[PDB]
Amino acid sequence: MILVVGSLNMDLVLRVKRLPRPGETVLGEDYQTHPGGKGANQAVAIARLGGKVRMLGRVGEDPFGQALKSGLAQEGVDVAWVLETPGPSGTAFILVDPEGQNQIAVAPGANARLVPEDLPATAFQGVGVVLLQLEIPLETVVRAAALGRKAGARILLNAAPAHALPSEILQSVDLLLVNEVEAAQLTEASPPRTPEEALALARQLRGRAPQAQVVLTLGAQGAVWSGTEESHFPAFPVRAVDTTAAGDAFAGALALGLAEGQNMRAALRFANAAGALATTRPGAQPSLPFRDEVEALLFG
Amino acid sequence: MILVVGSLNMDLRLPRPGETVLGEDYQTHPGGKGANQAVAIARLGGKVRMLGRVGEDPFGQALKSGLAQEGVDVAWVLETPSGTAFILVDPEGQNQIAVAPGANARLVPEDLPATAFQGVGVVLLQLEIPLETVVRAAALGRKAGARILLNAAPAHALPSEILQSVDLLLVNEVEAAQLTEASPPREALALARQLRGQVVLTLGAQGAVWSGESHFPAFPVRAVDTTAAGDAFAGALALGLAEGQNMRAALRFANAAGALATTRPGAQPSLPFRDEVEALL
């Protein structure tokens, strides 16, 4: 059983010729509205892969709030710990170009009101893995890890979007999951390139600031893992339509792989499979693949 | 009055990929080049009508009642089965914008009644509606006996037919280049607008040039947000000519509105009132 603690966002999406550079006005088409948020996406990702999942976070007392909560319940995620909030739900401004590269700006809304006291112990009882991200306040992330350990869950921190982390969080996490910008933020010096070797060396560096399994995602180059092994796990070759929610599929698939009892080798392959499929359909949450697609792609 | 025919938009800590500016603002205000130009005239104490399409969504209502509360006649604003700008802004006033035309793409020639043009002194147009509707709006303006002000913005190619049918052709340095060829590195901007040519070429903090042959200096101000500077200038110029001011005093009156727009954040909210622009005289 997995608990996901994190954000619920309404995604407002535009197809664009080209992502605007600073100062640029670009013309877009095909305006669309879908439930999203790193938290809600990772919960739904676990559900479509057939894992049992609860979601703990806040929606606002607006139309979107109901749509965010109902969306989750419909996918069969347990929404008993989704709390109603004065003011607006989270909203996200997404642009996607023809290569599937995106640009996202998030208005936190009710996600900013998820405080430590909002975390009851019964949401964590009997869960094997707690899955956290950073579209909620850092004091809430600390409490979630604490309550997670107290219940005997593995703490999976997806440190995204990019944010500075205090030692208290980095030291209390079983697995730290970051993309290259998050890895560079926390380490200083980017991998302005890949060799898969370069981000292994940075994932070894991030390893120094804790005692977790460290996982670094590389988009079209897959992922690396510094922990009980130092290894690269290649991407599945697919046609990428919209890269939105691919880290969410991957995070959610890693969580459920470890929940179900898979080792890291298997769970990371499973996760690259799921993150690859998410690139091949448009939109965030709607692109989240189902167990049988993911298993098809693994079987080859 | 002045008739404005063009766009209405609602203008609305980031996954970077491709990259966003490090800055945290957006929320909700009426915008679009048409709406902004109309509100500009209204805030400058001018009688003004807005002609264009909103959607059947909450925004559509908000845009309409928004323009109304500023003092714009919205009678001719047609509901449609809204245009949206996703605006990201950093603390240094730098912007990234993604526009979804919505209803604005559905404003077709047969949408323009001649009633709306009757008695008006200036028809003010931009290029945020289909080109065939701009053509219609010009033709109906000429019929009603109005001066047709084309603001050829945003940057787009135009045929000789359209260029030859307007009484004033308002452009910036990128649009000037688009229609002619080769950016004015300045004057050379005045020799480019004569290659165009009444043609008005805006130059930011260097003000505006004219030839039908003169340059009108910028009002020096603290530029925090250059958004809606073109809209305030366009709206103000349109109001100076409909008020019967000379071209020289109107272009000074445009620069003065233009400069005051730069001094406050956002688009429609930064548009100066009359008392403000008259003080800067």
Ligand SMILES: Nc1ncnc2c1ncn2[C@@H]1O[C@H](COP(=O)(O)OP(=O)(O)O)[C@@H](O)[C@H]1O
């Ligand atoms: N073009 C791609 N081809 C194959 N897999 C991809 C592609 N883009 C992303 N992925 C998968 O999704 C995961 C997340 O990619 P990445 O861009 O690092 O995440 P995020 O969207 O959080 O930045 C990768 O590890 C990989 O499994």
Ligand SMILES: Nc1ncnc2c1ncn2[C@@H]1O[C@H](COP(=O)(O)OP(=O)(O)O)[C@H](O)[C@H]1O
């Ligand atoms: N920094 C500035 N200082 C003074 N006046 C300015 C400044 N920026 C713009 N303006 C005024 O507002 C207008 C700005 O239009 P401009 O920046 O040339 O093109 P755009 O249509 O892209 O906004 C007029 O050109 C000018 O009078």
